[PDB]
From Swiss-Prot:
The entry's keywords: Disulfide bond, Glycoprotein, Protease inhibitor, Repeat, Secreted, Serine protease inhibitor
Pfam families attached to this UniProt entry: Kazal_1
Entries under Gene3D superfamilies matching the protein: 3.30.60.30
Entry protein name: Ovomucoid
Glycosylation sites: 45
Domain notes: Avian ovomucoid consists of three homologous, tandem Kazal family inhibitory domains.
Length: 56
């Protein structure tokens, strides 16, 4: 069960911009921004969850 989440409703997306607004995944990766994160949630078939906001 997810404690926290982001809005990944409109994903997948072909590109992201490069702003550095970090998110820490449950896989212990820091994702540079929400769009990289929500791209990875989709790619992982929803196995990826958000651990917390900010860099791991």
């Amino acid at each position: 069960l997810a404690a926290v989440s982001v809005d990944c409703s409109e994903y997948p997306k072909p590109a992201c911009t490069m702003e550095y607004r970090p998110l820490c995944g449950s896989d212990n990766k820091t994702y540079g921004n929400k769009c990289n994160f929500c791209n990875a949630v989709v790619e992982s078939n929803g196995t990826l969850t958000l651990s917390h906001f900010g860099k791991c």
